[PDB]
PDB file of C-alpha atoms and ligand atoms in Angstrom:
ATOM      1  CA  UNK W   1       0.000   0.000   0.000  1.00 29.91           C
ATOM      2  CA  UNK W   2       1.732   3.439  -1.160  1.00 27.86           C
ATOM      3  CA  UNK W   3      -1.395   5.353  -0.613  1.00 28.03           C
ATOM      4  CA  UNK W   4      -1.759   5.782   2.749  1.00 28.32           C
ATOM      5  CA  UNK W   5      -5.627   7.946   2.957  1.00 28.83           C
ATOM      6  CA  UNK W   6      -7.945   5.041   2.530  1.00 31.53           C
ATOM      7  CA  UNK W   7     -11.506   5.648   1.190  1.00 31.05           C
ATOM      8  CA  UNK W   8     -14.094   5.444   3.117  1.00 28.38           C
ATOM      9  CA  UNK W   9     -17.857   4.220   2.350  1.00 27.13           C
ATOM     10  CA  UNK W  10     -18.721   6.648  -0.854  1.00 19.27           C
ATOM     11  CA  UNK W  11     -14.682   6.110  -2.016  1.00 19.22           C
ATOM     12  CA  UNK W  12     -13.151   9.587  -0.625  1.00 15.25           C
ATOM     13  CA  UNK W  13      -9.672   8.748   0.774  1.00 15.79           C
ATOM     14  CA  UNK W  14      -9.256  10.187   4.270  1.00 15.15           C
ATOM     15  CA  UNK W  15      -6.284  10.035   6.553  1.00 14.67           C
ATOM     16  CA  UNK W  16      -7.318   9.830  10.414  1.00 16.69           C
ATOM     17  CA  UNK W  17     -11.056  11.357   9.491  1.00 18.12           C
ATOM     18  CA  UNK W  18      -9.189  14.227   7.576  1.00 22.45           C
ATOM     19  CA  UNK W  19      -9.770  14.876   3.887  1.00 20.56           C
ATOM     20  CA  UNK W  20      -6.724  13.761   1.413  1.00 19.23           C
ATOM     21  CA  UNK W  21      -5.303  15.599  -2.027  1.00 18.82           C
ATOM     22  CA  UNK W  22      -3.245  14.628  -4.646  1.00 18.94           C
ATOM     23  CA  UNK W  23      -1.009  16.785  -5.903  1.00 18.11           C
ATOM     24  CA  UNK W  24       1.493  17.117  -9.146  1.00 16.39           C
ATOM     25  CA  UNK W  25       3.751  20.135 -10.409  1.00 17.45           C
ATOM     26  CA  UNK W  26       3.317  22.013 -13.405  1.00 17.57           C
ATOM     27  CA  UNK W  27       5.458  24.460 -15.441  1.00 20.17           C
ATOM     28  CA  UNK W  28       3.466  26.426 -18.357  1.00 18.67           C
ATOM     29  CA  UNK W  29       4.481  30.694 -17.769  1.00 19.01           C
ATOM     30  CA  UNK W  30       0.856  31.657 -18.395  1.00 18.35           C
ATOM     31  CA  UNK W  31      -0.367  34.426 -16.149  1.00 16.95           C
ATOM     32  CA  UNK W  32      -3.111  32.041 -15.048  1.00 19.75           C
ATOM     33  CA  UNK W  33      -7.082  31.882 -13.930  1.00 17.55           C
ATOM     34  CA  UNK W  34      -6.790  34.412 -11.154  1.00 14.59           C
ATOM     35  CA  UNK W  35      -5.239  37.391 -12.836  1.00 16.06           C
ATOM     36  CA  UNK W  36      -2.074  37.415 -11.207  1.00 15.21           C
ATOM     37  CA  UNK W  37      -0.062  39.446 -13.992  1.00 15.67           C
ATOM     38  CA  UNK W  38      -0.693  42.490 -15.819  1.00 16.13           C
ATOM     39  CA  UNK W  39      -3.884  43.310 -17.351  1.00 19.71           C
ATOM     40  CA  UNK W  40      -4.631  42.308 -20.928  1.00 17.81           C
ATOM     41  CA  UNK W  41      -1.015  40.382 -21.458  1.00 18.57           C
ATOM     42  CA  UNK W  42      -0.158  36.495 -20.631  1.00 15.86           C
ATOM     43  CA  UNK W  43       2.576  37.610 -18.610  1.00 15.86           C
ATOM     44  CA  UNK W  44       2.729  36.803 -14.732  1.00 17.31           C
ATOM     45  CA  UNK W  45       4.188  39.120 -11.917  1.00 16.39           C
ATOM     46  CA  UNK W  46       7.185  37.251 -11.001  1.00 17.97           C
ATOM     47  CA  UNK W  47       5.690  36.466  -7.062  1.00 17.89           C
ATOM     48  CA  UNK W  48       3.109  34.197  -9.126  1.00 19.28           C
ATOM     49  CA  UNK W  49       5.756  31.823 -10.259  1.00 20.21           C
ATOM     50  CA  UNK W  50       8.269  32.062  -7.317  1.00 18.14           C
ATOM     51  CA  UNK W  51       6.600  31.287  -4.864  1.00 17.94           C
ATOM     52  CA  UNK W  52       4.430  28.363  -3.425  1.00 19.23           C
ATOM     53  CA  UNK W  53       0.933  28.865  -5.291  1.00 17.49           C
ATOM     54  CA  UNK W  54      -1.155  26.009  -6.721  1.00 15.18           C
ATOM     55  CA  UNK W  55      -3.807  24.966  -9.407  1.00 16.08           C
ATOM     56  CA  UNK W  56      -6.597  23.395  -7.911  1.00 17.68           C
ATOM     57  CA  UNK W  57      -9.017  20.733  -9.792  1.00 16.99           C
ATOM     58  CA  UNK W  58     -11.779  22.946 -11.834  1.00 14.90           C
ATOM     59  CA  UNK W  59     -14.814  22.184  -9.230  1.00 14.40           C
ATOM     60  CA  UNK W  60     -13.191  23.433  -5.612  1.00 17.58           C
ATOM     61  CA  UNK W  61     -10.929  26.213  -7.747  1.00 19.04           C
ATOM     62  CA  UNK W  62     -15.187  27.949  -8.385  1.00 19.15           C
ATOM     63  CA  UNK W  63     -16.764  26.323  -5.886  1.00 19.77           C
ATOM     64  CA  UNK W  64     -18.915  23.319  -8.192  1.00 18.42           C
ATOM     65  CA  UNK W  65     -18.982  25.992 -11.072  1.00 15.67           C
ATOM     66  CA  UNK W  66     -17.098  26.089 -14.309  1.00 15.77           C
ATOM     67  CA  UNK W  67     -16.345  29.272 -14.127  1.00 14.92           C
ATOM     68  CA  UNK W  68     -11.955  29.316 -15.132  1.00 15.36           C
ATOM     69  CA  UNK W  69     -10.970  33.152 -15.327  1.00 15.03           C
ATOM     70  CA  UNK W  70     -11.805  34.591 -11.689  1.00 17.46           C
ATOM     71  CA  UNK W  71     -12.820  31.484 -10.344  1.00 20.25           C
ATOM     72  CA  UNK W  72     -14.536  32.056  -6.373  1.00 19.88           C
ATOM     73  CA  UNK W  73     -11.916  30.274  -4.773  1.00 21.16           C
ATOM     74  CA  UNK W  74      -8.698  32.467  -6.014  1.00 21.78           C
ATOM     75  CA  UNK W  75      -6.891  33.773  -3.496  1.00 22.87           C
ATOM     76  CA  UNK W  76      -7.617  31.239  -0.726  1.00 24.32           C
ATOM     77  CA  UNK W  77      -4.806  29.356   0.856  1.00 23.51           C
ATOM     78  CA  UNK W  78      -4.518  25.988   1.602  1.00 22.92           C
ATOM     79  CA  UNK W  79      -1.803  24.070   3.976  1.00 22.09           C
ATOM     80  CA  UNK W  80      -1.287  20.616   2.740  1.00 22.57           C
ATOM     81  CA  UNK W  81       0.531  18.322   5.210  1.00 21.77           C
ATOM     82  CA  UNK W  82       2.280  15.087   3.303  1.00 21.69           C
ATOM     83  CA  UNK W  83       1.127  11.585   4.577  1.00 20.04           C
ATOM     84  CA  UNK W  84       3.995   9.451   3.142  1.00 19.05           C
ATOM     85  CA  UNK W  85       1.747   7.769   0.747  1.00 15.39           C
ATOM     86  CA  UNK W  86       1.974   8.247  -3.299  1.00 17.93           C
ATOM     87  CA  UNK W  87       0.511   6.965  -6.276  1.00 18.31           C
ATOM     88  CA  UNK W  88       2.633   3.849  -7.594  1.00 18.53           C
ATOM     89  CA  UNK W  89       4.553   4.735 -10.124  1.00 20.27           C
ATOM     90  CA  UNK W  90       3.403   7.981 -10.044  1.00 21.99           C
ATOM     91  CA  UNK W  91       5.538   9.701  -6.820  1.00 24.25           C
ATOM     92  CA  UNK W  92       7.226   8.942  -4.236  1.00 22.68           C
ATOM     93  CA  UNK W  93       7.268   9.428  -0.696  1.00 22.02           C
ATOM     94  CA  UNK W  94       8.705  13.109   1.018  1.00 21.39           C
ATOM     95  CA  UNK W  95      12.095  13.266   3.300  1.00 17.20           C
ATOM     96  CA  UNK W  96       9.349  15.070   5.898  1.00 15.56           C
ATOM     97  CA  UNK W  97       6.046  15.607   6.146  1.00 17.11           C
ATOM     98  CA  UNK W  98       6.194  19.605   6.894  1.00 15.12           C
ATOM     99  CA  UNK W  99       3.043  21.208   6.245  1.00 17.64           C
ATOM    100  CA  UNK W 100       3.149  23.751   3.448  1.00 17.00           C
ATOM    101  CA  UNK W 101       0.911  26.445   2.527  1.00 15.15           C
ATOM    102  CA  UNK W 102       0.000  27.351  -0.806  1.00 15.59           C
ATOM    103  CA  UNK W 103      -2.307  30.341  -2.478  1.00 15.86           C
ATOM    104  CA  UNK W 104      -4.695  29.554  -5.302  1.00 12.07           C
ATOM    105  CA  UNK W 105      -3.587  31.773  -8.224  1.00 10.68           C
ATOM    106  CA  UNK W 106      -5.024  29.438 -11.299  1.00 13.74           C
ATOM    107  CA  UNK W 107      -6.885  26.130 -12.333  1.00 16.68           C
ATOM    108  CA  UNK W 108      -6.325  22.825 -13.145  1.00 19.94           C
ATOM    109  CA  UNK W 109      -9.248  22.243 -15.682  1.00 20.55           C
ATOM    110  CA  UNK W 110     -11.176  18.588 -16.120  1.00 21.83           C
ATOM    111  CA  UNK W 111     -10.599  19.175 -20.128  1.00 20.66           C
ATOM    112  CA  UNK W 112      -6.779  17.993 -20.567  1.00 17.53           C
ATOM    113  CA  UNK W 113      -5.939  16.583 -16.834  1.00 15.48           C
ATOM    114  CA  UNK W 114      -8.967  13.941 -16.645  1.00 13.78           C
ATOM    115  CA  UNK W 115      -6.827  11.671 -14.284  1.00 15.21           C
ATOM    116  CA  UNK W 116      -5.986  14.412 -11.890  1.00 11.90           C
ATOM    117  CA  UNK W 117      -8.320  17.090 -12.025  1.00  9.72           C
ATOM    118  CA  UNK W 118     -11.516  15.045 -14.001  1.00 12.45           C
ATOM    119  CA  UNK W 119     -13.191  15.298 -10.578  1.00 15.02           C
ATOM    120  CA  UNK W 120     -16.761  16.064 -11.185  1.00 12.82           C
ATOM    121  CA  UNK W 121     -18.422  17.769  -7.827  1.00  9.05           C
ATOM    122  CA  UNK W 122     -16.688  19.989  -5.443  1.00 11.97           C
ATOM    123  CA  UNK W 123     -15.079  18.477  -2.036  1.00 10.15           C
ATOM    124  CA  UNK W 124     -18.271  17.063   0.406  1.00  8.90           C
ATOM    125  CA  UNK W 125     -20.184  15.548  -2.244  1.00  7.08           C
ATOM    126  CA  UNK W 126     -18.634  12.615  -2.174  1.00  9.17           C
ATOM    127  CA  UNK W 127     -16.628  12.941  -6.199  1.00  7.19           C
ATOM    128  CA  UNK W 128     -13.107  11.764  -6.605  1.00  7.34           C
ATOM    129  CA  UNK W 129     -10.409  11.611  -9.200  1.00  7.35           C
ATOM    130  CA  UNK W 130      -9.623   8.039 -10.744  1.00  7.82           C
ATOM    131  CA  UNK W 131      -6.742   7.958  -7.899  1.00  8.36           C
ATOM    132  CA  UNK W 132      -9.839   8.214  -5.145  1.00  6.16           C
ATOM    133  CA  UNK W 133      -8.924  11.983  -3.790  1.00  4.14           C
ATOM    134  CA  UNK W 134     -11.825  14.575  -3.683  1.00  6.77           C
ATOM    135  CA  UNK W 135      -9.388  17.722  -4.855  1.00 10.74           C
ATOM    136  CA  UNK W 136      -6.441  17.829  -6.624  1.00 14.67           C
ATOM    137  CA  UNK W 137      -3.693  20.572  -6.221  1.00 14.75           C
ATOM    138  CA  UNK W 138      -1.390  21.190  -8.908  1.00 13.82           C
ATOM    139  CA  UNK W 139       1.674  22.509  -7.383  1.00 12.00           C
ATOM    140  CA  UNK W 140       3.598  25.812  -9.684  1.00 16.43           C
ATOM    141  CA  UNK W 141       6.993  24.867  -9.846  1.00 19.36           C
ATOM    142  CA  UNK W 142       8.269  27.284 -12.726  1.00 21.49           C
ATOM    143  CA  UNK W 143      11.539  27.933 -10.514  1.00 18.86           C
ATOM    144  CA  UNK W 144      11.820  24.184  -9.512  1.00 16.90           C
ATOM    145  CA  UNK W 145      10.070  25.587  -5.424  1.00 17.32           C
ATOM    146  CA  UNK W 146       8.658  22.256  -5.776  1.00 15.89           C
ATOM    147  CA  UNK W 147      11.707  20.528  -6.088  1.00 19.01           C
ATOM    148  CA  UNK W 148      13.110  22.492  -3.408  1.00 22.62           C
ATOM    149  CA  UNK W 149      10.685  20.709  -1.257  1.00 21.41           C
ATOM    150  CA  UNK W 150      11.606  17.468  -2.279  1.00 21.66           C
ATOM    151  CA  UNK W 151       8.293  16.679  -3.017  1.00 21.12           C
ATOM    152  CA  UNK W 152       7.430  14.122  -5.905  1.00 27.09           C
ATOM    153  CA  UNK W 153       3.505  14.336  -6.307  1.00 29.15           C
ATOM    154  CA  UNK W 154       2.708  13.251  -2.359  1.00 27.05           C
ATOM    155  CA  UNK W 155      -0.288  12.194  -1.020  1.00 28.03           C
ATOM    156  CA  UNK W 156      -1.544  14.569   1.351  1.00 31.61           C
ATOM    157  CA  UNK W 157      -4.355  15.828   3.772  1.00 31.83           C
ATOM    158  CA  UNK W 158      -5.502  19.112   3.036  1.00 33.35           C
ATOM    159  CA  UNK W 159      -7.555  21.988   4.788  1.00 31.86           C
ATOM    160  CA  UNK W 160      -8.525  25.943   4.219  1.00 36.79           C
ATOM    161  CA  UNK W 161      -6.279  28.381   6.471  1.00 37.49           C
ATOM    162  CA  UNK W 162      -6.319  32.426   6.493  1.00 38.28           C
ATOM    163  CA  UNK W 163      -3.314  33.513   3.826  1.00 39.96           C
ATOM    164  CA  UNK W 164       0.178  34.415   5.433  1.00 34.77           C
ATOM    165  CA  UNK W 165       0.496  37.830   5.209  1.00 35.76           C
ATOM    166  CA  UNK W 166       2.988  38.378   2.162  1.00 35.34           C
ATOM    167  CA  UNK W 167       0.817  36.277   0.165  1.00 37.09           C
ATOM    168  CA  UNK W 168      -2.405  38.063   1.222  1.00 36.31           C
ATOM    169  CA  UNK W 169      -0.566  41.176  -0.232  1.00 36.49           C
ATOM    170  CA  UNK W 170       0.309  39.850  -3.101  1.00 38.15           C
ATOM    171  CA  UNK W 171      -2.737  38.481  -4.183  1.00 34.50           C
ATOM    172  CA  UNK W 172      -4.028  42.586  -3.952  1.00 32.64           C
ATOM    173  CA  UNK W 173      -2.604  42.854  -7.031  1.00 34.34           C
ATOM    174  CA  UNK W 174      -4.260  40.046  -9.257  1.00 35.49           C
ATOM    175  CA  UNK W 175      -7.133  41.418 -11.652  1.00 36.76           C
ATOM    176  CA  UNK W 176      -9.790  38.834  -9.713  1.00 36.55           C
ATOM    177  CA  UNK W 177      -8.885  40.601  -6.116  1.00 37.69           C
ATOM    178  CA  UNK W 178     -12.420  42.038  -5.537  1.00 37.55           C
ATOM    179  CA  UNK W 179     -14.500  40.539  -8.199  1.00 34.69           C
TER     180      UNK W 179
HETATM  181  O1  LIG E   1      -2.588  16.771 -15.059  1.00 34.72           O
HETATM  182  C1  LIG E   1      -2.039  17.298 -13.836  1.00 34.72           C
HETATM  183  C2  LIG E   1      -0.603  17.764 -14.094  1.00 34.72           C
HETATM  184  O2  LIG E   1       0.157  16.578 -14.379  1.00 34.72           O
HETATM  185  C3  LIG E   1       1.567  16.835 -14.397  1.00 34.72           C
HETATM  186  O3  LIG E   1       2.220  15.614 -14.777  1.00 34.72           O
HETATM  187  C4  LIG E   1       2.351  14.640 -13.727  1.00 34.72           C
HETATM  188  C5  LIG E   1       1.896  13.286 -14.303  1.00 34.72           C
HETATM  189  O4  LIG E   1       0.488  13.228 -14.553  1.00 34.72           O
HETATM  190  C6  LIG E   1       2.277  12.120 -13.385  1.00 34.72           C
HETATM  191  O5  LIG E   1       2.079  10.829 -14.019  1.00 34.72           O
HETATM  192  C7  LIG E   1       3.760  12.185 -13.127  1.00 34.72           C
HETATM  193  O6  LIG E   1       4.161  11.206 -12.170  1.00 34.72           O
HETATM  194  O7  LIG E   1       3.982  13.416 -12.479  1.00 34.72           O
HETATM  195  C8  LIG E   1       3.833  14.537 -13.335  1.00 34.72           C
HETATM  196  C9  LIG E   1       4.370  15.715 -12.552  1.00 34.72           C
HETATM  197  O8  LIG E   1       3.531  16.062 -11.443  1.00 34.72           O
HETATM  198  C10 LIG E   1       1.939  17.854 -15.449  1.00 34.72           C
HETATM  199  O9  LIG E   1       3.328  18.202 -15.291  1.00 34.72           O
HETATM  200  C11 LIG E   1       1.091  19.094 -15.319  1.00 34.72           C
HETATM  201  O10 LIG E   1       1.368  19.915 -16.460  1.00 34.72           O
HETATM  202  C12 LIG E   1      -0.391  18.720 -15.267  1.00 34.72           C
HETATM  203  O11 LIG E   1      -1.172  19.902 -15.045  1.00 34.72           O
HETATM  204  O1  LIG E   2      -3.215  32.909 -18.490  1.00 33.26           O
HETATM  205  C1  LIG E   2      -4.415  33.706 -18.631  1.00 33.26           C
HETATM  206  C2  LIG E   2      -5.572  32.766 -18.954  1.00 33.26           C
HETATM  207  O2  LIG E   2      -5.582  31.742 -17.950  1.00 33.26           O
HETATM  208  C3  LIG E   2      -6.578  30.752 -18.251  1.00 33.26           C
HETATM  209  O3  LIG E   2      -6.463  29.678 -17.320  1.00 33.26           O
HETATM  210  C4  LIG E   2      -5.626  28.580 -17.728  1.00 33.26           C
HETATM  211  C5  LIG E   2      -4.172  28.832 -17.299  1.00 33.26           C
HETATM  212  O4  LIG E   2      -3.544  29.853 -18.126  1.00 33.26           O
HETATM  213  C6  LIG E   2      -3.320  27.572 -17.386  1.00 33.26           C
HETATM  214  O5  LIG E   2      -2.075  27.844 -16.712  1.00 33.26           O
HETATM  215  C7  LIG E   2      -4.089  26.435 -16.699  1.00 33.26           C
HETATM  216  O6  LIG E   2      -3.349  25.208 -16.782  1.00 33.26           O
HETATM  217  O7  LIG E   2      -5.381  26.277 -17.318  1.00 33.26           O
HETATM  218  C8  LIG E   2      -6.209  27.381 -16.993  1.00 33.26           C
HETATM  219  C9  LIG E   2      -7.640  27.092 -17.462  1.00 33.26           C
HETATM  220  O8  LIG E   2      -7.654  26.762 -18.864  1.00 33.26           O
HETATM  221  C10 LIG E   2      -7.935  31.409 -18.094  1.00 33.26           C
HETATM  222  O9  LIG E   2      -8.958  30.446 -18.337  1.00 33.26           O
HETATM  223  C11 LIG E   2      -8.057  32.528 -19.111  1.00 33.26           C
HETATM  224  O10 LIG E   2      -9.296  33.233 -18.918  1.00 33.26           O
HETATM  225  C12 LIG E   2      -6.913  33.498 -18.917  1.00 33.26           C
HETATM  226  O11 LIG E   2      -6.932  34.458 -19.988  1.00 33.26           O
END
């Protein structure tokens, strides 16, 4: 058994009652869902791919909608904690398991990343990816931050938290702040 969340009656993995994620990296430059780069251009302010922000699955990054410029979850933060467990084949398992904390900042849409992100309701109703998780984050790892971490797609639980405060500011500046 490399994953370590195991589902419970409706198939959503948990890990000691809490909710699990996958997660993978992605590298792509685009400004991305939330804005987060000048108006009008593709281009991203630099904070956007330095530091830790994420692509959720489509359905939590609007909240069950389909919405994927502005979607009603940009600009939360999430802190995913690693479990040890992986997909076989598909990751490995972390030197730690320090909790991180990451800012939504794009999407991760069903069309193109079925396995991953094909999940089709938002967390508590009871839809998971073919790997059995109810989200999915994709991790930004232009500048190899991902890397860094020594993280190779982990399994991990995941929860909502208030933003750290340089990421709060940051996110002022993205074209969905305030829409
Ligand atoms: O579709 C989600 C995301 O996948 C990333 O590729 C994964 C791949 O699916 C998995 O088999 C392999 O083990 O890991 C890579 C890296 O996480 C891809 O890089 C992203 O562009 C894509 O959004
Ligand atoms: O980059 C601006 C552009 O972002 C679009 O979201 C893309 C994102 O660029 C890409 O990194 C990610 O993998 O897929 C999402 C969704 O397709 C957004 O939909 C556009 O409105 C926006 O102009």
């Amino acid at each position: 058994r490399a994953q370590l969340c195991q589902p419970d009656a409706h198939g959503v993995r948990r890990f000691n009652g809490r909710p699990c994620a996958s997660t993978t990296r992605y590298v792509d430059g685009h400004k991305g869902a939330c804005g987060c780069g000048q108006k009008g251009s593709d281009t991203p302010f630099p904070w956007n791919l330095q530091k830790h922000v994420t692509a959720p699955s489509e359905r939590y990054f609007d909240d069950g909608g389909s919405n994927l410029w502005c979607g009603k979850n940009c600009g939360k933060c999430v802190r995913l904690t690693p479990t040890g467990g992986f997909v076989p084949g598909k990751g490995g398992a972390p030197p730690n398991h320090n909790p991180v904390v990451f800012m939504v900042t794009n999407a991760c849409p069903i069309n193109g990343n079925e396995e991953w992100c094909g999940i089709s309701g938002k967390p508590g109703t009871n839809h998971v990816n073919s790997h059995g998780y109810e989200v999915h984050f994709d991790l930004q790892d232009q500048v190899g931050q991902v890397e860094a971490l020594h993280w190779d797609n982990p399994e991990v639980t995941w929860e909502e938290v208030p933003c750290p405060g340089d990421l709060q500011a940051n996110y002022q500046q993205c074209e969905c702040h305030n829409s």
